[model samples]
Target: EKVEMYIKNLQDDSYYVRRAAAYALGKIGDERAVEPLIKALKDEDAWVRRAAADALGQIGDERAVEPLIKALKDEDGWVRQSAAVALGQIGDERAVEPLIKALKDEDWFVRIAAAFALGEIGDERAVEPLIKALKDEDGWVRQSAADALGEIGGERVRAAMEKLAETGTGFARKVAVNYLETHEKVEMYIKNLQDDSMPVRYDAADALGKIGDERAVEPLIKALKDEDPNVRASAADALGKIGDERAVEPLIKALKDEDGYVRFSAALALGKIGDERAVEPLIKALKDEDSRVRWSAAYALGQIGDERAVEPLIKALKDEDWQVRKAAAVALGKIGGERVRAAMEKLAETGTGFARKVAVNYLETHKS
Candidate 1:
């Protein structure tokens, strides 16, 4: 009686009444409701059409597939989105080409739903288009395409992924490099270090660092002088991640770069290498014009933990910038000794409010 009552209300005077009735019939799951629900798909109200499509999808009748496919081109985006979801749920082979075509819908929500449908269907015919979809402007669509490829993988997909790794940009390049690591393409990542696009070069440097191949060490070192400051910074970060001692001198020289970011990254790379050779240069860097470079230098000295850095780090505790003062306090804590502890006690008692807080936090956590 409840299903019958809801079904009769599908013809009600109000659009909301019709939409609620259609939604209720869908949950009732009676095959008898199929034809009425399909008729409701053409309702003058898009809300009615959207509710009808959702109900049809829940009931999962193959008879609804063709109507849902036609609904994919509805004038309203929400109707198109609901139709795409319904088609995917029905999983009828007849809907594949129509779903693939919907991947280029003008509305992003429609296209997103269509991409998910193609993946849900798991048809090989959708692979090439999905590969191209990997470059969709929206990150979510690109991610969906990548996930689709994972679900429909083959030798053909591997070739596509490799090509993307070598030449793709943005999300395409990101997805390609993620899979390339499993396929031994460190050389391909190295080659991209010189990509004409700055973003490509930046991502290539990041990929090479994560790959950590010794062959990339020389190429990465060469990238330290790149024209783009971001490229130079990326190279310094990569060298630090690679942990090669050979980059020590170049990184030490990079510590004086005019760009604060390059100098900051160089200090971190030198600290990561932990070469005694970087101690005095980093101590001098504590006085750099940029406060961030000074902060990085203080952090690097703490990472090195050399006794010679004790005096300069102590003096930096009084640096005008609160951030530099914070870094100096943290560094002293990292390089703990009787003298460092005594200096921290002095700061805890006499430093500015910000410095005193950092010193006390460090002292509380660092208590031996």
Candidate 2:
């Protein structure tokens, strides 16, 4: 016989008692009170409702399905969200459609829960709805959709993404672009960069770099001068992501912008973009009074992967700011050669833990 005592304890004045009461009733090795527990789903206290959900799952009562579905539309978003998950754990097929609809519920968190529940249920019927939810407006919902699709992988989902590539929304286009970043369809993404919309165009620039297409060089360079800063930033970042030389000159000019964000982004972009031509400008940037700008400049030269930065970066190894010296050491390690190796070996003998650690990590990861 399951005790009704804990249900009363859930209403106690002490918060811990109430919380423990919920956990106990939910996990109390018993199914006798399943009906009362289902009714408890309507509890005004969110914690109590949560406990009731836990209890129902442990109870595994088929009769609790409808009540749990009603809970899925509960006034409290978290309660509704929890109900969807608990219904999933109970593995009741009847809960599947309701969970799918709950995914479109007003709250993003609840929608995330609904996506998760549908994935757990694993019904083929839930596939199309999950795909739609994958393209949901909220980032979290879309993330959940990707996770669910990954869980439910098949020809169906891949084919759906392939079809979506032709006409999906901007958000959907980004997801499709992610799918095609591999061997095939790299050019399809480059074509997306020319799309009419800003976001679509932005994602296309981003995608082209990830695909590492040299074909993107002309378009990406053209985009560096775009009127919109965001598009320009994306273009700059994409150029960096491609690690190509073509972006060096424009990005070096970008390093002088009034927009500090744009300037630093250009410096970092030049670094990741890995253009050795920018090394001299980056060294000049190390002398910029702004620590962040100096850091970005040093970091970029290190990524240039050419020995040209070794002496300049070594001079930075003596900078007053510990962070600057640290950055210099890291860059030196990244551009490892007989010269950088000798420089870091000397810096580690005299530099702070910060500098030594950076030097050691560099030697480990980029060791010849």
Candidate 3:
């Protein structure tokens, strides 16, 4: 029988021949090869052992489980990785404990393979151990654990990920926050906006913005006043993304924030909301000490397209900062009228440097 020839070749003088014979026998899917493949798993050559483990996985026979479990402790990391993957492919409950133990393997590849295998099995028993693996020293292993937990999700897994989102650090924090968005627990992210860790609050705001849930609108508006300017800025950004009318008044208040960056974000957010209330406050911000805020205010006014913004934006065209002047030129073109068009023409001839270039560009495009 061909199966018998492969079984016999498993003892061939060449290790590669032995490995190949094991590989072919597994694909053959004959019950007779299972015991012989198990025997090959103990071969002195690690390659043969690795091949045999892979073969046993493909065979999908329960008889391979115990031998593959023993192979999990193989001296060779590749063999151990192969055994872990095989156990996962077989989807046997018996392999769960061994796979959990393999998560702590000295080799990171072995740990990653074990995490994936546990996920493939989809056993609730692996959830806690996999959550623990989220703290693995290696980034790939930690990422694998987070992804596995996502696949085997339960209420407990959700709670664990939320805890990590709030408290976990480094790659774990990033994974937890990114993955948690799919859960639609806007309330949890809203709470995260108040986390003591500034990174947590920042990430929470970004995640809420991406989720685009209305529930986060009020919490984010309140976060506009967070002590950390980055959090406040991110909150302003998230509020803009939500585009909720409720955020209009608070974002207008944020226009006066001491931090230039926060003021800038507030300006942009107000423009995105376009509630008409922001037009006056945004015009006032044109004279803010920070040129960046003035630039954003110009852009926001353009987005608002209010006639009231036309004159303030024109005055901004003469501001000292070239970027502010450039933004003002663009704003005027957005709020275009015969008067504004004539103003752009005058500036194009008289203005200098970057501002003059912007005026020239605007007039060229808006010719009547």
Compose the digit string of candidate 3's lDDT tens values, residues 1-368.
35556878988888888977987886774433666789999898998899899988876555689999999999999999999999987767789999999999999999999999998777789988998898888999998998898877878788887888999888778887987887736687888888989999987887677557899998898898898998998888778867898999888889988898889888888888887889999999999998778888998898888888877887897797765775787788778987787777777788876657777888778767
lDDT values for all models: 0.81, 0.73, 0.83
Off by more than 4 A, model 3: 1-184, 346-360
Q: Over the full model, what C-alpha lDDT does candidate 3 score relative to the true structure? A: 0.83
Give the range of the ten consecutive residues with the poorest summed lDDT in model 2.
29-38
Model 1 TM-score on a 0 to 1 scale: 0.51
Listing every candidate in turn, what is its Cα RMSD in Å to the true structure after a full C-alpha superposition? 20.9, 18.6, 23.0
What residue runs in model 1 are displaced by over 4 Å at the alpha carbon?
Answer: 1-184, 195-197, 345-368
lDDT of 2 by residue, 105-178 (tens): 99999899888877765556787898888668899898887777666566777777788777787766677667
Better of 1 and 2 by lDDT: 1
lDDT of 1 by residue, 1-368 (tens): 46556766877888889988987876774434666789899889898899899888876556698899899989999899899888776666678899889888888888788888777666678888988898788878888878877765667778888999898888888888988786535687788887788888887776676556678888888889888998898888878877899999989989988788899889978877899999999999999998778878988888888878877987887787665776787678778877777767787898777767766776788677
